[PDB]
Chain A
Amino acid sequence: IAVLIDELRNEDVQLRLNSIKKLSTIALALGVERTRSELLPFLTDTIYDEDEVLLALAEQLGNFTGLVGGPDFAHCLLPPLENLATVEETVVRDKAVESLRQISQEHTPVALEAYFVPLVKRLASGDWFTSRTSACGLFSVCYPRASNAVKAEIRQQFRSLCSDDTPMVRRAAASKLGEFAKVLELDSVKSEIVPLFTSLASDEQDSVRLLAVEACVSIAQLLSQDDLETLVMPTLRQAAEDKSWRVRYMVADRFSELQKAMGPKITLNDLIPAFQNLLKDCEAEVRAAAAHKVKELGENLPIEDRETIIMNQILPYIKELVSDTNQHVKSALASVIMGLSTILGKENTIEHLLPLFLAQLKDECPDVRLNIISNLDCVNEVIGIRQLSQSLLPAIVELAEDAKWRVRLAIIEYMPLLAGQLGVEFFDEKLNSLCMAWLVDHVYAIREAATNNLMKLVQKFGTEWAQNTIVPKVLVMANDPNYLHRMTTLFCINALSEACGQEITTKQMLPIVLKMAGDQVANVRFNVAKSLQKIGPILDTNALQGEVKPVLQKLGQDEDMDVKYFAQEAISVLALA
């Protein structure tokens, strides 16, 4: 208990870490007065320690705001916290800066203007870059609760940090530029922040230019619309054509939030051309990001010009990117191409997107096909079931037996929608063969998806059609010599039992399952045990006791211990005993 204060000075690393973890308890025992008077100064004098002990201590000192008697004496934590911010390692530096940001809220405004602001002035003036990097993340939290002169001093310090010759400090300043500009008043933003943003966006290293572009969205959000064309728009246009591919990638990634922040008028004149250039960029990653963000840009376009702007300036580039050499660009475009069908309308979809859809359906890239099939419900709703069946259905049936199993999984998981839209008669005439053949597929996941699809179809089309059409084919699939297909039949019976009703289940499903119980393979035997446990409640007690009881009893005597255990579980859960 009281020994932990001496254990803090023990040489052992792990014991020191444990005592740092117990620091909260020790300090609770000490009391606010003795903790502040003795423990806190002790930490500052002995701060030098292994980086792991430093990081753990910085995390622990976070909840000390109350253990120091409250905000009246929260300043006692400012000297220990500052030393942790100096530590060269990054992870401890981030914990220290987070702790200081949390503590800044507790301090009274006079405390901030008298204690916290000098601390960050000292951190910003530290000789080592770490001090300046830590200080870069503190101007935002303490700025609003200070006075005008202090605010001007804080601004000057931030300007000095931005104009630092150290690349890493400039990187940190560019990272925190948006957060600092949020708290800053708009009049100051126009006069002081904008020059800093322009300077950072023209930095020698692209690692700073990308962060400047990243903060550009917050800068645009803060300012009013009329100021963008004169203060930020030239800066962003210069960044859209920047040599480094990384700046162009950062522009593409945040393009949706950017145009939304700029509004419609800025987008039609200064951004649509930039997106066109960005879509056809030399670098593949930039093209992939732009193709990913195409649906969001097309969705946030002004209503008056959306259709025209997509038709003329966007659609040809989408057509070109459809046949792009790189696979990632095609996969990214295929994931959000279906989103533009609702926007464009039925006639425009069948006139332009359908050819592209067909082209992407036959593409050799598995990811492209998977992405295209996943969002086909949008096109189904846009153009109706008739046009989809006239155009997409051959592609659907072709992909139903594709080599890649995941594509088959996607199309099978989407099939019930088609079955519902086309009606039961059409599914029986044309699609039933495919659904029935999906059961004997070599991939277990396809078989499970087919079983779920069967459950969905018989619950959609009722029990009668199920018994007329699907029940026989499945109950005949049992004879297959391969045990995997016997497992498939048992799984299908399990899924169909809930929907078929008690009468149909007891009449046809039960005899097949009882016959399978006598199968030579143990795997099918205990699977039968599982099936009887699952479909047990549906059947009435009379039929249960009459038939399944001596069957589960016979199975309980099987040589396989798995069959025994599963038969016991089934006989216990159903209380048949």
Chain B
Amino acid sequence: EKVFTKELDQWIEQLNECKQLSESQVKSLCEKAKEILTKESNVQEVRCPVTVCGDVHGQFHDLMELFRIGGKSPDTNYLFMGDYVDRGYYSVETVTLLVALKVRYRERITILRGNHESRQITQVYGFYDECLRKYGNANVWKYFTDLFDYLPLTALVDGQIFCLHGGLSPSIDTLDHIRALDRLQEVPHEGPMCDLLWSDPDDRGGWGISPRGAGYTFGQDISETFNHANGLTLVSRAHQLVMEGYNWCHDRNVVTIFSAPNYCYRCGNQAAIMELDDTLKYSFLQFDPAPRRRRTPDYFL
């Protein structure tokens, strides 16, 4: 029935003006999105024309800025690597808009799990407090994290590009393994899924304790071996912040894309996105943050 499609269109139109929905609306949206997300494999096949976008971290105005550069969400295929709930003053609107886009247009947009998309990380940061402020309870927070539990770990664009928010893992050796992992769980603190979302590329030439709490760091040789074994030509990631917004590492065998300009409103990094056409010729579009223009007591409840 198209009545729910029209209601979703109305919801998306409302969210485009940074106006969050109600508790029941978001609950129904997450329940609908879970049905289509649980039907998606751990690694998802992606059509040739697609624009891959890195972390947005709930900067909603910068997300509208991103939509201006790439294009309208239905018109242009979009692929979001992850981390769209924390370090943002508009995280709720950003994540619910992304989820609404995913349910309304499953083919035109795919969202991928990030390290930040987990109860622990979301709570130690402002997303839980944001949900409490904007709804007065943890119901919406619970629905969102339950949905995040169903997000895919990785996506594959025409078998030649590998899209994963974090990095390659020592336990993981081939894509077949990633398909095996059970992703319907909160990020394991240590394990293949953890490293898949927490790892970083570096020039130390080998697996090494990551400066971050969890995961390891993969050397150029590891990336080259992974591409040669899996026949991949390029791996796209977004976990590491890059001041440039796009970064070529490991002899162009890995690319780090950050789509959150002025990260934490303090970094002042210029963001960038990746666009893949029919010939999968990759091109990077860089953009800057969208122009911007007594509080209630914290014990008021």
Interface residues of A (CB under 8 A from B): 13-14, 50-52, 89-91, 366, 404-405, 442-445, 481-484, 487, 520-523, 527, 560-562, 565
Contact = CB atoms under 8 A, between A and B. Distances in A.
A523 B48 CA distance: 11
B139 to A, nearest CB: 16
B76 A89 contact: no
A405 B49 contact: no
The 10 closest A-B pairs by CB, nearest first: A444-B71, A445-B68, A52-B300, A482-B277, A483-B49, A443-B69, A442-B285, A487-B75, A521-B49, A481-B278
Contact of A483 (B107, B278, B283, B296): B278
Interface in B103-156: 105, 107-108
A481 B68 contact: no
A320 B256 CA distance: 44
A442 B283 contact: yes
Given A521-B49, A560-B107, A565-B5, A481 B279 contact: yes
A366 B278 CA distance: 34
A445 B277 contact: no
Interface of A is mostly: helix
A565 B4 CA distance: 13
Interface string B262-295: 0000000000000101110001010110000010
A404 B297 CA distance: 41
Given A442-B285, A445-B68, A482-B277, A562 B297 contact: no
> B interface, by DSSP: helix, strand, loop or mixed?
loop
B75 A13 contact: no
A444 B283 contact: no
Interface of B: 2, 5, 47, 49, 68-72, 74-77, 105, 107-108, 275, 277-279, 283, 285, 287-288, 294, 296-297, 299-301
Given A444-B71, A523-B108, A481 B297 contact: no
A14 B136 CA distance: 12
A404 to B, nearest CB: 8
B77 A445 contact: no
A50 B285 CA distance: 53
B72 A89 contact: no
B5 A405 contact: no
B60 to A, nearest CB: 17
B291 to A, nearest CB: 8
A91 B278 contact: no
A562 B107 contact: yes
A444 B69 contact: yes
A2 B287 CA distance: 61
Contacts of B2: 565
B69 A445 contact: yes
B74 A562 contact: yes
A257 to B, nearest CB: 22
Contacts of A523: 49, 75-77, 108
Nearest to B105: A562
A98 B294 CA distance: 16
A443 B76 contact: no
Contacts of B5: 565
B32 to A, nearest CB: 15
A404 B294 CA distance: 36
13 contacts: A52-B300, A89-B297, A405-B68, A405-B287, A443-B69, A444-B71, A444-B76, A481-B278, A483-B49, A483-B278, A487-B75, A522-B47, A523-B77
Given A52-B301, A560-B107, 10 more contacts: A52-B297, A52-B300, A91-B296, A366-B288, A404-B288, A442-B69, A442-B283, A444-B69, A444-B70, A445-B68
A484 B277 CA distance: 9
A91 B294 contact: yes
Contacts of B301: 13-14, 52
B254 to A, nearest CB: 23
B248 to A, nearest CB: 19
Contacts of B285: 442-443
Nearest to B277: A482
Contact of A481 (B47, B108, B277, B288): B277
Given A445-B69, A523-B49, A523-B76, A51 B277 contact: no
A521 B77 CA distance: 11
A484 B76 contact: yes
Given A91-B294, A405-B287, A521-B49, A444 B68 contact: yes
B108 A562 contact: yes
A520 B107 CA distance: 15
Contact of A444 (B72, B105, B297): B72
Contacts of B68: 405, 443-445
Contacts of B288: 366, 404
A484 B300 CA distance: 50
A445 B68 CA distance: 5
Nearest to B283: A442
A487 B105 CA distance: 18
A13 B301 CA distance: 8
A408 to B, nearest CB: 12
A435 B47 CA distance: 32
A176 B301 CA distance: 32
B192 to A, nearest CB: 33
B294 A90 contact: yes
A363 to B, nearest CB: 16
B76 A51 contact: no
A14 B299 CA distance: 12
Contact of B297 (A91, A442, A445): A91
Nearest to A406: B291
Contacts of B294: 90-91
Contacts of A522: 47, 107
Given A444-B68, A445-B69, A51 B75 contact: no
A448 B152 CA distance: 33
Contacts of A443: 68-69, 285
